């Protein structure tokens, strides 16, 4: 599945700067969900791909940014 990278402490999305293909998001997504994950910059937030069904993505409960 796919979803936004979520900071598990603040509950925020990761803002990114270069829309579309983005190494920063690829790197941040793999670091959170594993080396098999992908990710790119979408509406200026990291959107992670190839996630296992159970992976925790935005939004987290009661963790508002």
């Amino acid at each position, epitope marked *: 599945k796919e979803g936004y990278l979520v*900071d598990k402490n*603040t509950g*925020c*999305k*990761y*803002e*990114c*700067l*270069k*829309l*579309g293909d*983005n190494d*920063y*998001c690829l*790197r*941040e997504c793999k670091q959170q969900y594993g080396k098999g994950a992908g990710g790119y*910059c979408y*509406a*200026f*937030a990291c959107w992670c791909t190839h996630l296992y069904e159970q992976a925790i993505v935005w939004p987290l409960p009661n963790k508002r940014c």
Partner: antibody, heavy 116, light 109 residues
């Protein structure tokens, strides 16, 4: 939550100027930061921005190669190195906090004037 | 590359307090929901009004409402207070670079 910017002033075409922005009232580390600008009496234009940990950076086409953005998270500051200035760069320059697509907090603005 | 064009109408809106103000923002093509709104009083820096089509920024009164998705966005000020006379700018963020409308000046009638 407040932003404060400095280092604006007068300059000559081809000249250089370095702006600086200081954040207070929030965890500077956690936020993407941006420079935007506004020609007096005209509309807004995004200039440049930098992500958490300085891991992603970008610039508006009109400014790519001439400007260089950077941050220092210990000092809670954001910088803009302006080079090879032109008449177009004449504007109020705003520092702003990223709101994931939008800009939720703006400083007061510092004026940059390039003649002729 | 091309840039999303945002067309705000009317350029100038005459309204008296207590009346309802309706602002439009139209995009050259669909930006889905990634449409922010700003307010700017003279000599002042802009402030965030909406972060996307319908999400009010913190501190903004519920008299302001945004709606729309795709190409046609509306900002509605239900019962205009005098402090609401300002310039309103729309801004898209689906595509790069981000772009802004040319603004709608809300003046008193």
């Amino acid at each position: 939550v407040q932003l404060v910017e400095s280092g604006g002033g007068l300059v000559q075409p081809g000249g250089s100027l370095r702006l600086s922005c200081t954040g207070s009232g929030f965890t500077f580390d956690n936020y993407a930061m941006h420079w935007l600008r506004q020609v007096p009496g005209e509309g807004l234009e995004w200039v440049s921005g930098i992500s958490r940990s300085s891991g992603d950076i970008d610039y508006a086409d009109s400014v790519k190669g001439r400007f260089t953005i950077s941050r220092d998270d210990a000092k809670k500051t954001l910088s803009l190195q302006m080079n090879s200035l032109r008449a177009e760069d004449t504007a109020v320059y705003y520092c702003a906090r990223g709101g994931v697509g939008s800009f939720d907090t703006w400083g007061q603005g510092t004026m940059v004037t390039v003649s002729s | 590359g091309s840039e999303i064009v945002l067309t705000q109408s009317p350029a100038t809106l005459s309204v008296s307090p207590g009346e309802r103000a309706t602002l439009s923002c139209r995009a050259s093509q669909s930006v889905r929901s990634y449409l922010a709104w700003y307010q700017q009083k003279p000599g002042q820096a802009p402030r965030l009004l909406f972060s996307d089509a319908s999400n009010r920024a913190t501190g903004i009164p519920a008299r302001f409402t945004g709606s729309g998705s795709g190409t046609d966005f509306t900002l509605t000020i239900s019962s205009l207070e005098p402090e609401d006379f300002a310039i309103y700018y729309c801004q898209q963020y689906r595509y790069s670079p981000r772009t802004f409308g040319q603004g709608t000046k809300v003046e008193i009638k």
